[PDB]
A paper describes a structure:
LtgG is comprised of two domains, a large β-barrel domain and a smaller α-/β-domain that is an insert of the larger domain. To confirm that the aspartate at position 343 was catalytically important, we generated a Asp343Ala (D343A) mutant protein.
We focused our studies on one of these proteins, LtgG (BPSL3046).
Numbering used by the authors: 34 to 271, 280 to 372
Amino acid sequence: PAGAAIVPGQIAAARLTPVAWQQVPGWQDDSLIGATIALRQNCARLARQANWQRACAAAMRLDDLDVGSARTFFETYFTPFQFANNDGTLDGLVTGYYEPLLHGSRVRRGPYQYALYRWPAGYRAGASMPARAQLMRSGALSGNELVWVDDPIEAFFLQVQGSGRVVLDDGTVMRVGYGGTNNQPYRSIGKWLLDHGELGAGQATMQGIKAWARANPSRVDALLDTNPRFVFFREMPSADGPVGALGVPLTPERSIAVDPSSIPLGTPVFLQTTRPMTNAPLNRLVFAQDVGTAIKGGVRADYFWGLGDDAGDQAGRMKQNGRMWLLFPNS
């Protein structure tokens, strides 16, 4: 029932080594559910390249339910190449990312009681502000509200990420991105709850912190004030996941960010790794559709877990050994 496991520390004599599909350990462990969705987004940018025209034409005939036919397609139109680091090692690091998804309103009302703030107009770009607790008390933020959300813990973790999306009670969606900082030190509230015994070793996830906050509503404001850092936001230019560097919406658990000088955008990658909390095998066909400032090296990926806080808790814990095969179209 559980998938193929990595034998660590193996090495290879070439950067790319063609292998048979029968030599990809883990290929049969992937259901392939969702892979055709990310494949069609890939083809939106690749279909007219000479090497991709035939594969993309065939790909448009596949539905997303018949994973038997999708498996036959990948085995027929692509060859897998075992991918090594330039030092010959096959092991590399898989981390994770997500897109925060909050629920808010453009006006303060009902459950929407916690503001996200733009950079305060009464202030000069890049001048140091006080800690969060005094910034919130000075009055300097009043009238600089960008939108009002559902939950102060979600707002806090949106600040940690710097960017995300707010589903508004409109029926519209607002994308927010990085709008500046008070340049004061970050201090994790999860570590605070652990260091002071309020949360057990297991449990300082975003969900465990939300639960503790639910239990201790009159302590929440003081907990958040233990982090002096404060992040501001800007509204981004106006259905599916975020758009990545390839220019297409990312697909949860089927898109990775890569170092594009090692793995060009558009490359499908068979990823063998493990799940962050249970450590079970995770064997997944993904597509290189994004990049990131921390994602540098050869066998290196950021796995896109999807939208919302369960995806973020998986992303937060992901720091797993991994193996890669790059697919190239037979063409």
